[PDB]
Scaffold this active site. Structure first.
Site, PDB file in Angstrom:
ATOM      1  CD  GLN C  15     -35.548  21.682   6.651  1.00 58.53           C
ATOM      2  OE1 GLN C  15     -34.634  21.267   7.365  1.00 58.53           O
ATOM      3  NE2 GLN C  15     -35.747  22.979   6.422  1.00 58.53           N
ATOM      4  CD  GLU C  71     -26.041  20.503   5.162  1.00 58.03           C
ATOM      5  OE1 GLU C  71     -26.313  21.561   4.552  1.00 58.03           O
ATOM      6  OE2 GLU C  71     -26.148  20.387   6.399  1.00 58.03           O
ATOM      7  CB  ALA C  99     -23.361  25.512  -2.673  1.00 56.71           C
ATOM      8  CB  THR C 179     -28.664  31.260   7.522  1.00 57.34           C
ATOM      9  OG1 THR C 179     -29.359  30.606   6.451  1.00 57.34           O
ATOM     10  CG2 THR C 179     -29.313  30.891   8.850  1.00 57.34           C
ATOM     11  CD  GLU C 183     -30.405  34.033   2.482  1.00 59.48           C
ATOM     12  OE1 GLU C 183     -30.111  33.342   3.480  1.00 59.48           O
ATOM     13  OE2 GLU C 183     -31.580  34.194   2.091  1.00 59.48           O
ATOM     14  CG  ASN C 228     -41.082  24.118   5.924  1.00 59.49           C
ATOM     15  OD1 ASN C 228     -40.880  25.067   5.163  1.00 59.49           O
ATOM     16  ND2 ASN C 228     -40.098  23.410   6.461  1.00 59.49           N
ATOM     17  CD  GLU C 254     -57.010  24.292 -17.144  1.00 56.56           C
ATOM     18  OE1 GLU C 254     -56.740  23.235 -16.538  1.00 56.56           O
ATOM     19  OE2 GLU C 254     -58.177  24.714 -17.292  1.00 56.56           O
TER      20      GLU C 254
HETATM   21  N1  LIG Z   1     -39.663  28.558   4.398  1.00 54.71           N
HETATM   22  C1  LIG Z   1     -38.489  27.953   4.534  1.00 54.71           C
HETATM   23  N2  LIG Z   1     -37.328  28.616   4.189  1.00 54.71           N
HETATM   24  C2  LIG Z   1     -36.128  28.001   4.326  1.00 54.71           C
HETATM   25  C3  LIG Z   1     -36.060  26.704   4.815  1.00 54.71           C
HETATM   26  N3  LIG Z   1     -34.760  26.340   4.849  1.00 54.71           N
HETATM   27  C4  LIG Z   1     -34.010  27.370   4.396  1.00 54.71           C
HETATM   28  N4  LIG Z   1     -34.842  28.410   4.079  1.00 54.71           N
HETATM   29  C5  LIG Z   1     -34.417  29.705   3.531  1.00 54.71           C
HETATM   30  O1  LIG Z   1     -33.515  29.431   2.479  1.00 54.71           O
HETATM   31  C6  LIG Z   1     -32.422  30.324   2.488  1.00 54.71           C
HETATM   32  C7  LIG Z   1     -31.119  29.525   2.536  1.00 54.71           C
HETATM   33  O2  LIG Z   1     -31.148  28.504   1.561  1.00 54.71           O
HETATM   34  P1  LIG Z   1     -30.973  26.935   1.899  1.00 54.71           P
HETATM   35  O3  LIG Z   1     -32.066  26.112   1.259  1.00 54.71           O
HETATM   36  O4  LIG Z   1     -30.950  26.723   3.393  1.00 54.71           O
HETATM   37  O5  LIG Z   1     -29.519  26.566   1.306  1.00 54.71           O
HETATM   38  P2  LIG Z   1     -29.246  25.296   0.342  1.00 54.71           P
HETATM   39  O6  LIG Z   1     -30.238  25.219  -0.795  1.00 54.71           O
HETATM   40  O7  LIG Z   1     -29.252  24.019   1.152  1.00 54.71           O
HETATM   41  O8  LIG Z   1     -27.780  25.553  -0.272  1.00 54.71           O
HETATM   42  P3  LIG Z   1     -26.435  25.552   0.621  1.00 54.71           P
HETATM   43  O9  LIG Z   1     -25.810  26.928   0.569  1.00 54.71           O
HETATM   44  O10 LIG Z   1     -25.466  24.556   0.041  1.00 54.71           O
HETATM   45  O11 LIG Z   1     -26.773  25.203   2.052  1.00 54.71           O
HETATM   46  C8  LIG Z   1     -32.602  31.227   3.697  1.00 54.71           C
HETATM   47  O12 LIG Z   1     -33.077  32.491   3.294  1.00 54.71           O
HETATM   48  C9  LIG Z   1     -33.648  30.540   4.541  1.00 54.71           C
HETATM   49  O13 LIG Z   1     -34.453  31.482   5.206  1.00 54.71           O
HETATM   50  C10 LIG Z   1     -37.224  26.034   5.164  1.00 54.71           C
HETATM   51  O14 LIG Z   1     -37.171  24.885   5.597  1.00 54.71           O
HETATM   52  N5  LIG Z   1     -38.441  26.664   5.020  1.00 54.71           N
HETATM   53 MG   LIG Z   2     -27.651  23.460   2.842  1.00 59.30          MG
END
Ligand SMILES: Nc1nc2c(ncn2[C@@H]2O[C@H](COP(=O)(O)OP(=O)(O)OP(=O)(O)O)[C@@H](O)[C@H]2O)c(=O)[nH]1
Ligand SMILES: [Mg+2]
Ligand SMILES: Nc1ncnc2c1ncn2[C@@H]1O[C@H](COP(=O)(O)OP(=O)(O)CP(=O)(O)O)[C@@H](O)[C@H]1O
Ligand SMILES: Nc1nc2c(ncn2[C@@H]2O[C@H](COP(=O)(O)OP(=O)(O)O)[C@@H](O)[C@H]2O)c(=O)[nH]1
Ligand SMILES: [Ca+2]
Ligand SMILES: [Mg+2]
Ligand SMILES: [Mg+2]
EC number: 3.6.5.-
Lengths: 5, 54, 439, 428, 344
Positions: C15, C71, C99, C179, C183, C228, C254
C-alpha cells in the site's frame, strides 16, 4: 419453568 | 564554519558544512532451520492425531 | 547507470508502494499507461530515472519493483489499480492463506512455500540490470508477512546477492491503528533476524505520522491512505537522489557511508517539513530558515523522541524546490546556538546538505498542499533508542507470562528463539547507550 | 482463509442456526429462494465467506443441519428460509438422543456421525481456501452437546490445521428443568477446552434474566431468547462478513483473543438490547453504546466482569457514526476502568467499525471479551454437577450406554482445572 | 476523574501531595506499573521518560524535568556555569570552581593555578571537597584533600570557602538559606514566599577546621554533632519572618532588598539558561519540578549559589502550605478540577 419459535 | 565538496548540476547541488572537527549464514544452513521447524511442527501434529486416535 | 529494485512485502509494504510509485510517476511525468512524453531515450537509456524504471519497445516505463503478499486482496487492487498498466503480472505475487499476524507463520510455515518463487521473480529483474546496486525493502513490523517473510527474504538476498546493498523502510507499530496484540512480538523477532542483513533502515512510527496527520492536516480520523501519501513524500525525499541527478546520496552505498558509522546502529531518524493542509486555500510560505528549524521540532519527526538528550553521528539535509545554499548555511549557523545538538566526540559536528531543484510534487486531490520548498533531515541520533525501549517493555510484559507464545511454537518455532531475539535487542539499547550519554 | 463451513446440531442448534441465517441473509440482501436484491455492494464483497454460488447466481448457505430426530429440521425446512438450504445438507436420524450426552457421543450419534462428515467433506472441497468451522449447539441436551462434540473431535482429525469455532448455549435451571443437563454440560466443556480455538459462551441464564429484567418480558419464550442470540451472532461475525481491518478471519481473531490455548471461552455483549416488540425509535449515542456494551446487564454470559480481569477485548461498532468519537469513548473505558484490564497485555482492546448497521437499528455495538470472570459460569455448572455426582445420581442413564464413572471424574477434574487456570491469570 | 501513580515513596514531599490528591475525590491511584495514567510521581533516578506520551487519549504529566540533572549534580553544575555563555566564567554570584576526577575531561588542575595566584595572596583561601554522598573536608593547603579525593572513587569538585559569611547575633552564627522553586509545564518560574535558614548552632570561628560543625549547617550534622539546638530558634530553622525583623533591627535593611533580589536573580538565570535543553513546550509529554536552592550570604550582604537540590525536602511547617501549593500550580493547571507564589 415453562419457556416455544 | 567551512563549506566543502561543492558538487553542482542542473538538477541540484550539494556540499558539506563543518562547525568543529572530532575531539552471513549459508544457503543450506538457512534451509536446515526451515526444515527443523517443519519437523517440530509435524511432530506436534502427530501427537495430536495420536491423542485423537486414543 | 546502477539499477535499484524495490521489494514491497505485506499489506503495509504494498500500500505504501502504491503511494510511492504513484508519486514517482507524478514527479517523473509518467502516465498511468507507463508512457513518458518527457523521455526520448525510447527502448532504453542511461538516465537517472532508469535506476527505478526499465523500458520496453512500446515505450512503457516499468517499475523495477516486486510485490509480495501471502494474502491476495491487497495486491489484487494493484492489478485493477488506477496504475495497473505499469506493472506486468510477473511483478505481482500473491498467496491465499496469510500469516495471521504470526511471525513464525510468515517466516517458517507459509514462508518456505513461496521463498523460491519470489527469488525467482526478483532474479528476473536482476537479469535486466546492467549494474544492480541493491534493494529497497518495504514492510511492517507488526504484520505476519511483513515481519516473518521479510526476515526470510533478507537472509536469502545476503546469499544470492552478497555484495549488493539492502535498505529498509519499516513501519513501527502504534496501538492507535494496530490490528494485533502480538505486534511487539513480531517486531523484536523480525529485527533480531534481519539486523545483520540490513545496511540502513528508516523507521516510521504510525503514532507520529498519525498525529502529524491530525495536527497539520486537520484530519479527525486519519485513514491509511492519509498516512501513506505523507510517508511517500518522505520516501521520495530519500530516493530523489537516486532517481534524479545529484551528488549527495547518489547510490545506496553512500547512505551507509554518510549516515551509518556503526553497522548495527543504522536507524536514522527522519524529520520532514513543511506538512501543510490542502484545505487551507492560503498557506503562509515558510522560508528556508523556518522549515530548517522545524527539522528539530519533535512534532515533525517520523518517530517521537527527544534528540536533545541523545548524541548525533551524522546529519543530512535534503532540500527540495526553491532553495539556495546562502539561505541554508545561514539557517545552519542559527540552529547550532538555539538548539541542543551534541555530536559524538569522534565525529565532526557538521551537516551534509543536498538540494534538488524540482519541488515537492503532491497528488492531485490529496490532503497535502503543494509547497515551493521542503526539507527532509536524516539524523542518526541515539534518541531513536527510545523507540526500542518502548517496544521492549511491551515485549517483556507479555513474555513473562508466555502469553500468545503457543501460537508461535505451534508453527514449529522454538520458545528459545524469543529469548534469543530479546537478548539481542537488550544489546542494541546498550550500544545506543555507550555512544550517546555521559558516564 | 476464505470460506467458513457452518454446522448446527440438535434442537437448540438448529433453531439459533436458522435464526442466524435469517438475520445475516437479510443483512447481505439474500432472499429465501437465494437471489440477491440489495442496495449496497458491500453486501456481496465477502458473501463467499458463508455462502456458495450456483446457477442463476443463487446464493446457498454453506450450512449443514444435523439432528437425531426429524422434529426441528422439518420445522426449519418449513421455516421462513427453509428452502434456502441445500436439501442434501439435511442429515437426520429418527431415534433421538433423549437429552443424553452418551447417546449423542457414543451410541445413537456414532451411528450417524459418518454420514454428516460426508457432507462436511463435500463442502470443504468446494472451498478455495477453508478457514475452519463454526458450530451452533446447546451443551445441555444430548444431540447438540454429545454428537456436536463428537463431530468436533472427528473434524479436528481431518482438519487439524483449521480453526474450530463454536456458539455454545450453556444450560440454566432458570430455563430448563431437565436434571441431567449439568452432566451433559461438564462432559461437553472437557471436549471444548481441548478441541476448539474459539467458543462464544451464550448463557441461557443471562438471556432469561435479560428478557425478564431489562426487556420486561414476564413470560420469555425461546424466540425471545434467540432474538438476543441472533443479534449477538450477527455482531460477533460482522468483522468476518463485511470488509474490515480487525479480526477479519477466525485465525486472526483467535490470535488476538486467545493468549493461552485453553482459555478461549469468550464473553459476548451487545447493545442496544432489543426485543421483537421493542420500538427502538431513538438511536443511541456513541457514549451510550459504550457504557452499555461494557455493562453486565448486556453480557450474554451471566458473569460479573468486575469480578475478573479482561485478558483481551474485541469491540465492533455498526452503522454510520463518528469513527473519531468511537475511539475516544473506547479509550475512555480503558482509561476509566483500567484496573479491570490486565497490565501484562498492553493494548488488549481492539476496535472495528462497520458502516452497515444491523436490521432495525441505526447504531449497534457488539462485545467480545476474554474475561477471567467467565470462570463463574463454569463454577456454576460445576456445583450443579457435583451436587448429583457425589451421590452418583442419574448415572445409570449414562452407564447404560457404556460410559463409566471415571469418565465423569475426569471431565469434572478437567473443568475444575479450567476454573483454576482462569483464576491463575486473574491474579497476575 | 483522574489517574496517577507513585514510584518514589521515600520522598517526603510527594507522599504529602499524593495524600492531598486522593482527598479531592477526583484522583484515583493506580499500581506503580500501570501505563494508563495522567500523572507520574516518578523515581529520583532512572526515571523512564522514554515511555511517556505514547498512550492514545491520555494527557501525561510528570514531576521531573529530563536533563535537569545537569543543574543539580555538583560537577555538572560547574561545567554548566563555565561552558554556558549566558553564565560567564566570570560569574558574579557563583564561587570559583573546577571539576575534579581522581587518579583512578579532568579540569585537574587549572585549579592549582588559582592557588599560586594566592601564593601571592594575602586574601586567605580555603576550598571544600563535597560530592555525591551525604558522608567533606576543608583546609587551606590543597594537597591535603587532593589525596582525600584520589582516595575515594567518586568524582569531586573544589570551590573557595566563603571566609567572611554573614554572622547572626546573638551567637556569632553561620547559616544558609533554602529557597523552594516550582517550574510548571509552561516554564513559569514560581518562588515559594516562605523560605528557611539552616542556621548553625555555635559561634563561627576560623580556628579549627576538622569536623568542627560550626562550618557546616546541615540538619543532619547540627542535630547529631552538637549539644546545641533550639537555644535561639527551634529546629535551627529560622523562617523568613524572623530573619526579616532581625536584619532591620540589626543592619537596618530588609530580606527583600538585601538578599531576596539576588536570590530571585540567580533562580531566573539558572533555569532560563537550561530552558531550551529541558522544556516540554512542544513534547509529547509535559514536565514540572520542585527545586531547592541553597544560598550563602556574606557580611557585605552578597548572595552566593551553593548547589541546586533536585529532590528537596521541606520544612515541617511549610508542608501543608507548599504541597498544597504544588497541586494548585503544577498539577491542577494541567488537570482541572470542578497566591503563595511569585512569578519570575
Ligand atoms: N502506515 C501504514 N501502516 C500499515 C498499513 N497497513 C498495515 N499497517 C500496519 O501494519 C501492522 C500490521 O501489518 P500488516 O502489513 O497489515 O500485515 P501483513 O504484512 O499483511 O501480514 P499478515 O499478518 O499476513 O496480514 C499494523 O500495525 C498496522 O498499523 C498501511 O497501509 N500504512
Ligand atoms: Mg495481510
Ligand atoms: N564556597 C563556599 N562557601 C561557604 N560554604 C560552602 C562553600 N561551598 C560549600 N559550602 C558548605 O557546604 C555546606 C553544605 O552544603 P551541601 O552542598 O552539602 O548541600 P545539601 O546538604 O543541603 C544537599 P546534598 O549534601 O544532599 O547534596 C553548606 O552549609 C556550606 O557552608
Ligand atoms: N436459547 C435456546 N435454548 C434452547 C433451545 N432449545 C433448547 N435449548 C436449550 O438446550 C438445552 C436442551 O438441549 P436440546 O438442544 O433441546 O437437546 P438436543 O436436541 O439433544 O441437542 C436446554 O438447556 C434448553 O434450555 C432454543 O431454541 N433456544
Ligand atoms: Ca527512456
Ligand atoms: Mg426436546
Ligand atoms: Mg440404532
Amino acid at each position: 419453568x415453562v419457556x416455544x419459535x | 564554519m567551512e563549506v566543502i565538496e561543492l558538487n553542482k548540476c542542473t538538477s541540484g547541488q550539494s556540499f558539506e558544512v563543518i562547525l568543529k572537527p572530532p575531539s552471513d549464514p549459508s544457503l543450506e544452513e538457512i534451509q536446515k532451520k526451515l526444515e527443523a521447524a517443519e519437523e517440530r511442527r509435524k511432530y506436534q501434529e502427530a501427537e495430536l492425531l495420536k491423542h485423537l486416535a486414543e | 547507470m546502477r539499477e535499484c529494485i524495490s521489494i514491497h512485502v505485506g499489506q503495509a509494504g504494498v500500500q505504501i508502494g502504491n503511494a510511492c510509485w504513484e508519486l514517482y510517476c507524478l514527479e517523473h511525468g509518467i502516465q498511468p499507461d507507463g508512457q513518458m512524453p518527457s523521455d526520448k531515450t525510447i527502448g532504453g537509456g542511461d538516465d537517472s530515472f532508469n535506476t527505478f524504471f526499465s523500458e520496453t519497445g512500446a515505450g512503457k516505463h516499468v517499475p523495477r519493483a516486486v510485490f509480495v503478499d501471502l494474502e491476495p486482496t491487497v495486491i489484487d487492487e494493484v492489478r485493477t489499480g488506477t496504475y495497473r498498466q505499469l506493472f506486468h503480472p510477473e511483478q505481482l505475487i500473491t498467496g491465499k492463506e496469510d500469516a495471521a499476524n504470526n511471525y513464525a507463520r510468515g517466516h517458517y510455515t507459509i514462508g518456505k512455500e513461496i521463498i523460491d518463487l519470489v527469488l525467482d521473480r526478483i532474479r528476473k529483474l536482476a537479469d535486466q540490470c546492467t549494474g544492480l546496486q541493491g534493494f529497497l525493502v518495504f514492510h511492517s513490523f507488526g504484520g505476519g508477512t511483513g515481519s516473518g517473510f521479510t526476515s526470510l527474504l533478507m537472509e536469502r538476498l545476503s546469499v544470492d546477492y552478497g555484495k549488493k546493498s539492502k535498505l529498509e523502510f519499516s513501519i513501527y507499530p502504534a496501538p492507535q491503528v494496530s490490528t494485533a496484540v502480538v505486534e511487539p512480538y513480531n517486531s523484536i523477532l523480525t529485527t533480531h533476524t534481519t539486523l545483520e542483513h540490513s545496511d540502513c533502515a528508516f523507521m516510521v512510527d504510525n503514532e507520529a505520522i498519525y498525529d502529524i496527520c491530525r495536527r497539520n492536516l486537520d484530519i479527525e480520523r486519519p485513514t491509511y491512505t492519509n498516512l501513506n501519501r505523507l510517508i511517500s513524500q518522505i520516501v521520495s525525499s530519500i530516493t530523489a537522489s537516486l532517481r534524479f541527478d545529484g551528488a549527495l546520496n547518489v547510490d545506496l552505498t553512500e547512505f551507509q557511508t554518510n549516515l551509518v558509522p556503526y553497522p548495527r546502529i543504522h536507524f536514522p531518524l527522519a524529520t520532514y517539513a513543511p506538512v501543510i493542509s490542502a484545505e487551507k486555500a492560503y498557506h503562509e510560505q515558510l522560508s528556508v530558515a523556518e522549515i530548517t528549524n522545524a527539522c528539530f521540532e519533535p512534532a515533525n519527526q517520523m518517530v517521537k523522541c527527544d534528540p536533545r538528550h541523545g548524541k548525533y553521528m551524522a546529519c543530512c539535509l535534503l532540500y527540495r524546490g526553491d532553495v539556495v545554499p546562502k539561505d541554508v548555511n545561514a539557517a545552519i549557523a542559527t540552529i547550532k546556538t538555539k538548539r541542543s545538538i551534541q555530536f559524538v566526540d569522534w565525529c565532526p559536528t557538521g551537516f551534509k546538505v543536498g538540494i534538488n531543484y524540482q519541488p515537492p510534487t503532491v497528488v492531485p486531490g490529496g490532503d497535502l498542499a503543494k509547497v515551493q520548498r521542503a526539507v527532509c533531515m536524516l539524523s542518526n541520533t541515539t534518541a531513536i533508542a527510545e523507540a526500542w525501549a518502548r517496544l521492549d517493555h511491551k515485549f517483556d510484559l507479555m513474555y513473562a507470562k508466555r502469553a500468545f507464545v503457543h501460537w508461535y511454537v505451534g508453527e514449529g518455532m522454538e520458545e528459545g528463539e524469543f529469548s534469543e531475539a530479546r537478548e539481542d535487542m537488550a544489546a542494541l539499547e546498550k550500544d545506543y547507550e555507550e555512544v550517546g550519554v555521559d558516564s | 482463509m476464505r470460506e467458513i463451513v457452518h454446522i448446527q446440531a440438535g434442537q437448540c442448534g438448529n433453531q439459533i442456526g436458522a435464526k442466524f441465517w435469517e438475520v445475516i441473509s437479510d443483512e447481505h440482501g439474500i432472499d429465501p429462494t437465494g437471489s440477491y436484491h440489495g442496495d449496497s455492494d458491500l453486501q456481496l464483497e465477502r458473501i463467499n465467506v458463508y455462502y456458495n454460488e450456483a446457477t442463476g447466481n443463487k446464493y446457498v448457505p454453506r450450512a449443514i443441519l444435523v439432528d437425531l430426530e426429524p422434529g426441528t429440521m422439518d420445522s426449519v425446512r418449513s421455516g421462513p428460509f427453509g428452502q434456502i438450504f441445500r436439501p442434501d445438507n439435511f442429515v437426520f436420524g429418527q431415534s433421538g438422543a433423549g437429552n443424553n450426552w452418551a447417546k449423542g457421543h457414543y451410541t445413537e450419534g456414532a451411528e450417524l456421525v459418518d454420514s454428516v462428515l460426508d457432507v462436511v467433506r463435500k463442502e470443504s472441497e468446494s472451498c478455495d481456501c477453508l478457514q475452519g468451522f463454526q458450530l451452533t449447539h446447546s451443551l445441555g441436551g444430548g444431540t447438540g452437546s454429545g454428537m456436536g462434540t463428537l463431530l468436533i473431535s472427528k473434524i479436528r482429525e481431518e482438519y487439524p490445521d483449521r480453526i474450530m469455532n463454536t456458539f455454545s448455549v450453556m444450560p440454566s435451571p432458570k430455563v430448563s428443568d431437565t436434571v441431567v443437563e449439568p452432566y451433559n454440560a461438564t462432559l461437553s466443556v472437557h471436549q471444548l477446552v481441548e478441541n476448539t480455538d474459539e467458543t462464544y459462551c451464550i448463557d441461557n441464564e443471562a438471556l432469561y434474566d435479560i428478557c425478564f429484567r431489562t426487556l420486561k418480558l414476564t413470560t420469555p419464550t425461546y424466540g425471545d431468547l434467540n432474538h438476543l442470540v441472533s443479534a449477538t451472532m450477527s455482531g460477533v461475525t460482522t468483522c468476518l462478513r463485511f470488509p474490515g481491518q480487525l479480526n477479519a478471519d477466525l485465525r486472526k481473531l483467535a490470535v488476538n483473543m486467545v493468549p493461552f490455548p485453553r482459555l478461549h471461552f469468550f464473553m459476548p455483549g451487545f447493545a442496544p438490547l432489543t426485543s421483537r416488540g421493542s420500538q427502538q425509535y431513538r438511536a443511541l449515542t456513541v457514549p451510550e453504546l459504550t457504557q452499555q456494551m461494557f455493562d453486565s446487564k448486556n453480557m450474554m454470559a451471566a458473569c460479573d466482569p468486575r469480578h475478573g480481569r479482561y485478558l483481551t477485548v474485541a469491540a465492533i461498532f455498526r452503522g454510520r457514526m463518528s469513527m473519531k468519537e468511537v475511539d475516544e469513548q473506547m479509550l475512555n473505558v480503558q482509561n476509566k476502568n483500567s484496573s479491570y484490564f490486565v497490565e501484562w497485555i498492553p493494548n488488549n482492546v481492539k476496535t472495528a467499525v462497520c458502516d452497515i448497521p444491523p436490521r432495525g437499528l441505526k447504531m449497534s455495538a457488539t462485545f467480545i471479551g476474554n474475561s477471567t470472570a467467565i470462570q463463574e459460569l463454569f463454577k456454576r455448572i460445576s456445583e450443579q454437577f457435583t451436587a448429583m455426582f457425589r451421590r452418583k445420581a442419574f448415572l445409570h442413564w449414562y452407564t447404560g450406554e457404556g460410559m463409566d464413572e471415571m469418565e465423569f471424574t475426569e471431565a469434572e477434574s478437567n473443568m475444575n482445572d479450567l476454573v483454576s487456570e482462569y483464576q491463575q491469570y486473574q491474579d497476575a | 476523574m483522574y489517574t496517577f501513580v507513585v514510584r518514589d515513596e521515600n520522598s517526603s514531599v510527594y507522599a504529602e501531595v499524593s495524600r492531598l490528591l486522593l482527598a479531592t475525590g477526583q484522583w484515583k491511584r493506580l499500581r506503580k506499573d500501570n501505563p494508563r495514567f495522567n500523572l507520574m510521581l516518578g523515581e529520583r533516578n532512572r526515571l523512564p521518560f522514554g515511555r511517556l506520551g505514547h498512550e492514545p487519549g491520555l494527557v501525561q504529566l510528570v514531576n521531573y524535568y529530563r536533563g535537569a540533572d545537569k543543574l543539580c549534580r555538583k560537577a555538572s553544575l560547574v561545567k554548566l556555569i563555565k561552558t554556558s555563555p549566558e553564565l560567564s566564567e566570570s560569574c558574579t554570584w557563583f564561587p570559583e570552581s573546577y571539576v575534579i576526577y581522581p587518579t583512578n575531561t579532568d579540569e585537574r588542575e587549572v585549579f592549582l593555578a588559582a592557588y599560586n595566584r594566592r601564593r601571592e595572596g594575602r586574601e586567605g583561601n580555603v576550598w571544600i571537597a563535597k560530592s555525591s554522598a551525604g558522608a567533606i573536608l576543608i583546609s587551606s593547603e590543597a594537597s591535603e584533600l587532593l589525596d582525600f579525593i584520589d582516595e575515594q572513587g567518586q568524582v569531586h569538585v573544589i570551590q573557595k570557602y566563603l571566609e567572611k559569611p554573614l554572622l547572626l547575633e546573638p551567637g556569632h552564627r553561620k547559616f544558609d538559606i533554602r529557597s523552594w522553586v516550582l517550574v510548571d509545564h509552561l516554564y513559569n518560574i514560581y518562588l515559594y514566599r516562605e523560605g528557611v535558614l539552616r542556621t548553625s548552632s555555635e559561634p563561627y570561628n576560623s580556628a579549627n577546621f576538622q569536623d568542627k560543625t560550626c562550618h557546616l549547617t546541615n540538619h543532619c550534622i547540627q542535630k547529631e554533632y552538637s549539644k546545641n539546638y533550639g537555644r535561639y530558634e527551634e529546629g535551627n530553622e529560622m523562617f523568613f519572618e524572623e530573619f526579616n525583623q532581625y536584619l532591620m533591627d540589626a543592619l537596618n535593611t530588609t530580606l527583600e532588598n538585601s538578599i531576596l533580589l539576588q536570590i530571585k536573580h540567580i533562580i531566573r538565570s539558572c533555569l532560563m539558561c537550561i530552558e531550551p535543553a529541558i522544556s516540554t513546550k512542544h513534547l509529547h509529554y509535559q514536565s514540572f519540578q520542585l527545586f531547592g536552592f541553597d544560598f550563602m550570604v556574606d557580611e557585605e550582604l552578597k548572595v552566593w549559589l551553593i548547589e541546586v537540590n533536585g529532590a528537596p525536602a521541606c520544612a515541617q511547617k511549610l508542608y501543608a502550605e507548599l504541597c498544597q501549593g504544588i497541586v494548585d500550580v503544577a498539577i491542577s493547571s494541567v488537570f482541572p478540577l470542578a497566591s503563595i507564589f511569585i512569578k519570575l
